[PDB]
Design a protein around this ligand. Structure first.
Ligand SMILES: CC(C)CCC[C@@H](C)[C@H]1CC[C@H]2[C@@H]3CC=C4C[C@@H](O)CC[C@]4(C)[C@H]3CC[C@]12C
Ligand SMILES: Nc1ncnc2c1ncn2[C@@H]1O[C@H](COP(=O)(O)OP(=O)(O)O)[C@@H](O)[C@H]1O
Lengths: 126, 338, 239, 57, 297
């Protein structure tokens, strides 16, 4: 049973730093590319960042690429998003998504609507 | 209320996990350690069925164990005589991307379907001698990924709209809808008694459905990625499942748990098709590479390899009497192995 | 076994007829080029399909449009009527001549999603050898947005601040440098994704187009001509 | 109220599939092994039988 | 009255060494090529048929070489008899001209697929390639059939058993006409065809610039060096073959003995240069291509 549980969030004043975490189970997690995706209220799922299997090849969306550093702990089987500088537009539900297949460079996550290998999300209000 | 319902669902999942763990005492490998290995089973390409223009996406044997139907995304359904390598029929399809084909157990009809979200039923035994579209089943909102003839009047079709459907072909209406899958349903397998069928989807879970009721009897969540292939064990009390996580898994319906995992360290490609031999001792699974591994289904040992396809093995089917295995690949070639 | 021989001869005759029809179908199939229309459903694909049709549709399932440039037949497929999950039904287009990727260049909010989709197409196992004809549509809207300046790309793409227009850029007459820089930055994002990987087995052909642009058929014809020229050169060991 | 309805349906499905009779995996494995053993001789794919007995050659 | 052949060492030492090197290289090259084409390639396309036929012709040329090497190393003395000499020279020449005509077929197929990649995609049939290959082989065999008659073994004043590639002195006058016909029909017209096709391919690849698609200068360089290799390896060969036939018919007098001795040496040098084709062709057509290397593990 593939499971992605997100923790961290809640109310944070603008300019604050917040560390979202996601515990992964049901898969190796050391051979999957991981993503952080975002759904703003009334906007739809939007890809925020992703990190490759080895932990390198990190990439961010332009709206956060100066912040929101993504990290991956394969030994602890967890994903992390450190949002150092926070803005009111960052208020959204943050989901941790897994790329559908292990050893692939493509990232065909169906952000909008339903995606199987996505967490329940954590609400971050700024 | 959403938090309470989610917590109740988590508690129910923990309860079923605990029940499965309590029922799990031995292991299939531990029990079959005393069973002699099946040996190096090597099959030979006794027929090569060529004539398709584009990649072969689907395959199905006839009940007579001689006639084959193959679907090619050039827009063709070719009925082959596998014994004499001749092409019995060539049916042009309105939509080229047909991802599934079915052969009726009576052999009178052949099914196909794909990106048009339509199951096309073709009468192979028309009076005038041609092949006509006897039925055009519509009602799925996603691509038709699998279809299996329950009989000449009923067909079960799995679709990319995360639903399966039992159709009455005579009325052309979706008599029963099977819902619960979260991802695209990619595979479908009728039980030998046809009272049940298991469907594997892209949510990394397989579901057992009662045809006469429409309710999902059980769910199996052993795999890690999208399930591409699924096949019932010859006994009907188990089924194998191939996924994009480069593993196959055997689930027993009564044990309600994984029994065995068929995987190797050197295979990192997804499984496109799975099948069982007559006794179920051998599980044949084609991969994204040019190969089809045959596994000792009781020992989890890779008994043998079928190689000879230039592109990825797309479809795999063991004939009804078990004499041969048809593997169709993306190189537009279908090979009979014996 | 005279009757058995007669049945065998009848089967051989039927197989020969089927093989003749299959050779004719092979000729027709190889003579025509299949194009996969991709991109966000909110801007570009339907208008391009309608423009090709003016130069044949179908709500049920795929929207198919057959057009002809010079004497060459192109069959373009916009895959509608499908769920938002693209990862499975897109493997069936592994053998198309080209993927025509239409991007609403004026929509900076959806530009990153288009870039992610382009990256997935480029790096997919079954689309590694397929070239992409990149249609950066709505160039008039992009010019209007750049001139008005209500929203800036640096808000959505911070690297645009340090971007300088390429030396090989060919601005149209009456086009201000700001529109040219924005347009070529948007193009260069996709081109950077395209050149990051591929090993030369596929190429990306970017074009700036609009709704009133009637040259899209010729652009697709020329890009497919180059695609099949490269395929021939690889086949001829000329590379 | 769509999310709560979906959650309620999932909870109902989990309740339905939780109260089923599960046999021990030892019994299921023994049954599958016995079926494979009882039908091994009828399986043509276990051995490469010469053309004198099988089709396709 | 016959010339003394002062420069005979070229036929005695240079030719055996060149033929030995050509055997050593081309045998391996064409064996690898045919192995890849038969047991490793796809069900084949139109161009693959021509490439396999060219590789086979080069391989048979290389297999014909060793008897010629033994013949040349012995001061042009033949041991295997008249019939064996006729068969060896006939096989040599059919392989050479079949390789030339299959190079022409490859060039024409490449011209169609490069200048007209879209218009030719329907006309690219494997069965047409098979028919054209069979026609090319049949035409080569028919046109080199007179070699089976002309290549008679003779005896000279030095008591040496010579195996005439061309003919004996009795039939030299008619063999000049036959050789002119073979050169014009089976080399000159193919030479013009290959030169024009590859020049048009160069023009297309330069003016189109391969658009912006992968357009590595390797493709243009190969398309330029293939015709130059063909020319500098076959034009001197045929020119000096006709010149040597004329010098054996005419000349043979003290007034022009030096000219005859010089043209004979140049003819031997060009005979070696033409043999170099059976080695250059597998490298330029298979080893120099990235697709063949990728299929080569
Ligand atoms: C060398 C002298 C004796 C002439 C010999 C003729 C031979 C070499 C020629 C004549 C007909 C030719 C064959 C015609 C048909 C085919 C089948 C094709 O799928 C591969 C090439 C192949 C196999 C050709 C190989 C070369 C060939 C066999
Ligand atoms: N121009 C020439 N003048 C005098 N003798 C020649 C001339 N060309 C060739 N010969 C001699 O006649 C024999 C046959 O010549 P030719 O057929 O041209 O070469 P090869 O013997 O190698 O086939 C050779 O042994 C050679 O020494």
């Amino acid at each position: 049973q593939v499971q992605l549980q997100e923790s961290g969030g809640g109310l944070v004043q603008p300019g604050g730093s917040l560390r979202l975490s996601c515990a992964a189970s049901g898969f190796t997690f050391s051979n999957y590319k991981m993503n952080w995706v975002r759904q703003a209220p009334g906007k739809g799922l939007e890809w925020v960042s992703d990190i490759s299997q080895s932990g390198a090849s990190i990439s961010y969306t332009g709206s956060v690429k100066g912040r929101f550093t993504i990290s991956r702990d394969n030994a602890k089987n967890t994903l992390y998003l450190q949002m150092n500088s926070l803005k009111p537009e960052d208020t959204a539900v943050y989901y941790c998504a897994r790329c559908p297949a292990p050893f692939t460079r493509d990232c065909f996550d169906v952000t909008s609507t339903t995606y199987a290998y996505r967490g329940q999300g954590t609400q971050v209000t700024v | 209320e959403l938090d309470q319902l989610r917590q109740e669902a988590e508690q129910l999942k923990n309860q079923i996990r605990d029940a499965r763990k309590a029922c799990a005492d031995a292991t299939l490998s531990q029990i079959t350690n005393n069973i002699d290995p099946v040996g190096r089973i090597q099959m030979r390409t006794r027929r090569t069925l060529r004539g398709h223009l584009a990649k072969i996406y689907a395959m199905h044997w006839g009940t007579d164990s001689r006639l084959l139907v193959s679907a090619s995304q050039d827009g063709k359904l070719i009925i082959w005589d596998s014994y004499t390598t001749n092409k019995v029929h060539a049916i042009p399809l309105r939509s080229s991307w047909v991802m599934t084909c079915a052969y009726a157990p009576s052999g009178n009809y052949v099914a196909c379907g794909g990106l048009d979200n339509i199951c096309s039923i073709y009468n192979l035994k028309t009076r005038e001698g041609n092949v006509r579209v006897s039925r055009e089943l519509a009602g799925h909102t996603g691509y038709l990924s699998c279809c299996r003839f329950l009989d000449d009047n009923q067909i079960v079709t799995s679709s990319g709209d995360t639903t399966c459907a039992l159709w009455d072909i005579e009325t052309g209406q979706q008599t029963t809808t099977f819902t619960g899958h979260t991802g695209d349903v990619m595979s479908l397998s009728l039980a030998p008694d046809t009272r049940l069928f298991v469907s594997g989807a892209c949510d990394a879970s397989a579901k057992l459905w009662d045809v006469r009721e429409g309710m999902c009897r059980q769910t199996f969540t052993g795999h890690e990625s999208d399930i591409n292939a699924i096949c019932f064990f010859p006994n009907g009390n188990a089924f194998a499942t191939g996924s994009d996580d480069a593993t196959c898994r055997l689930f027993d319906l009564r044990a309600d748990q994984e029994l065995m995992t068929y995987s190797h360290d050197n295979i990192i490609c997804g499984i496109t098709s799975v099948s069982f031999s007559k006794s179920g001792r051998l599980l044949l699974a084609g991969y994204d590479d040019f190969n089809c591994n045959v596994w000792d289904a009781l020992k989890a040992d890779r008994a043998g390899v079928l190689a000879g396809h230039d592109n990825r093995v797309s479809c795999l089917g063991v004939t009804d009497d078990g004499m041969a295995v048809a593997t169709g690949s993306w190189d537009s070639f279908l090979k009979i192995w014996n | 076994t005279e009757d058995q021989r007669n049945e065998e001869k009848a089967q051989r005759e039927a197989n020969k007829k089927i093989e003749k029809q299959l050779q004719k179908d092979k000729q027709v199939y190889r003579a025509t080029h299949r194009l996969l229309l991709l991109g966000a459903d909110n801007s570009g694909k339907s208008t391009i399909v309608k423009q090709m049709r003016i130069l044949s549709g179908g709500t049920s399932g795929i929207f198919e449009t057959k057009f002809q440039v010079d004497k060459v037949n192109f069959h373009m497929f916009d895959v509608g009527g499908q769920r938002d999950e693209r990862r499975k039904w897109i493997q069936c287009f592994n053998d198309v001549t080209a993927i025509i990727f239409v991007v609403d260049s004026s929509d900076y909010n959806r530009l990153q999603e288009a870039l992610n989709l382009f990256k997935s197409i480029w790096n997919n196992r079954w689309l590694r050898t397929i070239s992409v004809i990149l249609f950066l549509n709505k160039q008039d809207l992009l010019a209007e947005k750049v001139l008005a300046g209500k929203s800036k790309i640096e808000d959505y793409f911070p690297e645009f601040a340090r971007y300088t227009t390429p030396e090989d850029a060919t601005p149209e007459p009456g086009e201000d440098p700001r529109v040219t820089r924005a347009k070529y930055f948007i193009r260069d994002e996709f081109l950077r994704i395209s050149t990051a990987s591929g090993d030369g087995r596929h190429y990306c052909y970017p074009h700036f187009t609009c709704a009133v642009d009637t040259e899209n058929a010729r652009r697709i014809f020329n890009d497919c001509k180059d695609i099949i020229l490269q395929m021939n050169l690889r086949e001829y060991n000329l590379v | 109220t769509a999310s709560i309805a979906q959650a309620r349906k999932l909870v109902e499905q989990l309740k339905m599939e939780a109260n089923i009779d599960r046999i021990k995996v030892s019994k299921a494995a023994a049954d599958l092994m016995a079926y494979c053993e009882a039908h091994a001789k009828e399986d043509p794919l276990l051995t490469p039988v010469p053309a004198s007995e099988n089709p396709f050659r | 009255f016959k010339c003394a052949l002062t420069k005979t060492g070229f036929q005695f030492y240079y030719l055996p060494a060149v033929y030995i090197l050509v055997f050593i290289i081309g045998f391996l090259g064409n064996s690898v090529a045919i192995w890849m084409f038969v047991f490793h390639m796809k069900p084949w396309s139109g161009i693959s048929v021509y490439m396999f036929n060219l590789a086979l012709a080069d391989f048979l040329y290389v297999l014909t070489l060793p008897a010629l090497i033994f013949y040349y190393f012995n001061k042009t003395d033949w041991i295997f008899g008249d019939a064996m000499c006729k068969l060896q020279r006939f096989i040599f020449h059919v392989n050479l001209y079949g390789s030339i005509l299959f190079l022409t077929c490859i060039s024409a197929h490449r011209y169609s697929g490069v200048v007209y990649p879209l218009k030719s995609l329907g006309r690219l049939k494997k069965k047409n390639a098979i028919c054209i290959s069979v026609l090319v082989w049949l035409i080569v065999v028919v046109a080199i059939s007179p070699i089976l008659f002309y290549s008679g073994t003779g005896v000279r004043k030095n008591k040496t058993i010579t195996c005439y590639d061309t003919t004996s002195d009795e039939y030299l006058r008619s063999y000049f006409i036959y050789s002119m016909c073979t050169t014009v029909a089976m080399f000159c017209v193919p030479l013009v065809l290959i030169l024009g096709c590859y020049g048009l391919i160069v023009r297309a690849l330069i003016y189109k610039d391969l658009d912006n698609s992968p357009l590595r200068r390797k493709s243009i360089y190969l398309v330029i060096i293939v015709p130059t290799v063909f020319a500098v390896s076959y034009i001197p060969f045929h020119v000096m073959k006709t010149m040597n036939l004329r010098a054996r018919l005419d000349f043979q007098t003290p007034a022009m003995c030096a000219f005859n001795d010089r043209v004979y040496a140049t003819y031997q040098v060009t005979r070696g240069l033409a043999s170099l084709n059976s080695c250059v062709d597998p490298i330029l057509y298979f080893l120099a291509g990235d697709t063949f290397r990728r299929r080569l593990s």
